């Protein structure tokens, strides 16, 4: 009715990868960066407490935490892998976070390997009847109150 509120916010998850012309002493073959960012004219820091990137167990300190922008991780590696990415919200009630499963891929679907790639994934979050305090952070971050 007139009494309910729905707020929608958008996130982008992305990465780039480049094949090194010289493998490292460990045989790492690629340089890659994974990032989480808001869209044009959006500052996700107002409603995001932190972004956690869960790296594969082979990496040093695999849980990478970003408490302020830019939310990103830079690493050198030899294989693609699935990376949980958790976005923790500045909300005292549920939901406290949202979890994505991101494919950190170093080569495209086509069988031949490539020299470099990048990828962007868009995600829309919807919040129904969020708390007075959380609602403001969502909107202050470039969020959209859904008009009936």
């Amino acid at each position: 009715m007139d009494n309910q509120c729905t707020v929608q916010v958008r996130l982008e998850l992305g990465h780039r990868a480049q094949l090194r012309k010289k493998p490292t002493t460990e045989g790492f073959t690629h340089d890659w960066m994974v990032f989480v960012r808001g869209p044009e004219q959006c500052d996700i820091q107002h409603f995001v407490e932190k972004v956690v990137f869960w790296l594969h167990d082979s990496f040093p300190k695999p849980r990478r935490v970003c408490k302020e922008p830019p939310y990103k991780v830079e690493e050198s590696g030899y294989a693609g892998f699935i990376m949980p990415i958790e976005v923790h919200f500045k909300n005292k009630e549920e939901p406290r976070k949202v979890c994505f499963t991101y494919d950190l891929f170093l080569n495209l679907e086509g069988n031949p390997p490539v020299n470099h790639l990048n990828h962007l994934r868009c995600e829309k979050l919807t919040f129904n009847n969020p708390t007075t305090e959380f609602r403001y952070k969502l909107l202050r971050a470039g969020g959209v109150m859904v008009m009936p």
């Binding site: 594969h56 294989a79 892998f81």
Partner: peptide, 4 residues
């Protein structure tokens, strides 16, 4: 290529 190689996945882990």
């Amino acid at each position: 290529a190689a996945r882990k």
